[PDB]
Amino acid sequence: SHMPYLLISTQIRMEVGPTMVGDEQSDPELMQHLGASKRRALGNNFYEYYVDDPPRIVLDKLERRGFRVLSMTGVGQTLVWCLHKE
Amino acid sequence: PYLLISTQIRMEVGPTMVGDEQSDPELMQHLGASKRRALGNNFYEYYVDDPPRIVLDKLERRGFRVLSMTGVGQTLVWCLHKE
Amino acid sequence: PYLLISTQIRMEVGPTMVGDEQSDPELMQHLGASKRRALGNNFYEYYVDDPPRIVLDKLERRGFRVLSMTGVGQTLVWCLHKE
Amino acid sequence: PYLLISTQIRMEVGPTMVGDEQSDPELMQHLGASKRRALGNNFYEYYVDDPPRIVLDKLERRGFRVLSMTGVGQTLVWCLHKE
Amino acid sequence: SHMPYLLISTQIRMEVGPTMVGDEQSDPELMQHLGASKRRALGNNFYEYYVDDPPRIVLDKLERRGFRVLSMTGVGQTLVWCLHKE
Ligand SMILES: [K+]
Ligand SMILES: [K+]
Ligand SMILES: [K+]
Ligand SMILES: [K+]
Ligand SMILES: [K+]
């Protein structure tokens, strides 16, 4: 179902994918719209959604869906974007 | 009016820290938070098993908005404001 | 009009650095801040025992708003502006 | 209408990375960017020799505004939005 | 003279200078207004503008000149502020 907050991420380089676009409880229709695939990384008990696109492409698709970036941060070697439906 | 929440990577999974000892008990109860004292700390912390995206959606319904998100060590922190 | 405050992890516990040597003495007194000097520093700093969420709430009452929050090393820093 | 640009420290000197392989060729041309494939990468990147402050000013003239700036590794990244 | 964006920085501690306030192409009048001087770090072939003031002092001076902080970030042991003339 619809969720107003989204978290997306990519590891450096920022210009290339994959971009993580969702967790197990993400909107399946939105994940399908992004062209995302579902997988379970080694050691995780949860599925994650990801796309081969770089984050700029994902951000533009999310903008057309009504999402806006509220914040971006780095942690480890990962860039994370926090978006909100507004 | 201000809230600080956090999770360690992975961002898609909990636990999420949702409060310090002086947090509003009613808001903590609304989030379904548990209270615990980590080893070595003399203060209680409120936490939930939910990932941060779930907590952010619950706080949005309570009038909070994310002002900023940052990384420190291996932790992601969100600063929210009631407005 | 600008303020910089900080705390080291854990974010839920103090001390919180609330000023440099040239900070507004009246605002530092209002926050209940004390002066201290780190061993290798030739300057005084203002600090409170409160965690940063408590300081942020006191600063909102004085007309300050968080514009940005970031991590550096093991420190969380907030940049506030009086609006 | 989002953009991501970056530079490694020092922030006062280029090169500034201004685009990925699928970036708007007109905007890349407006920035005076060159296209190259770094050693070991299968993708092309757009870059300029200018420091990021110069790039930010050029993007401002095309209606872009910085929403966020962050550090990761030894890289500074800016996220801009056409607004 | 028109500087839509500014980048300033200091290394920790944030309560003490020097604060880097410009690159070689910065407006000399704004640099003079801040009381900035030029310096060259050993490894750089370019000069930078700096002040002995901590960043809070610089932010207040820039606020009086029409600048507003849009973002602040840490990278390595440096704090950087991105300001926009608005
Ligand atoms: K990437
Ligand atoms: K987590
Ligand atoms: K602390
Ligand atoms: K650079
Ligand atoms: K400093």
Residue numbers in the entry:
A (entry chain E), E (entry chain C): -1 to 84
B (entry chain A), C (entry chain B), D (entry chain D): 2 to 84
What does the paper say about this structure?
GFRP occurs as a pentamer of 50 kDa (5 × 10 kDa).
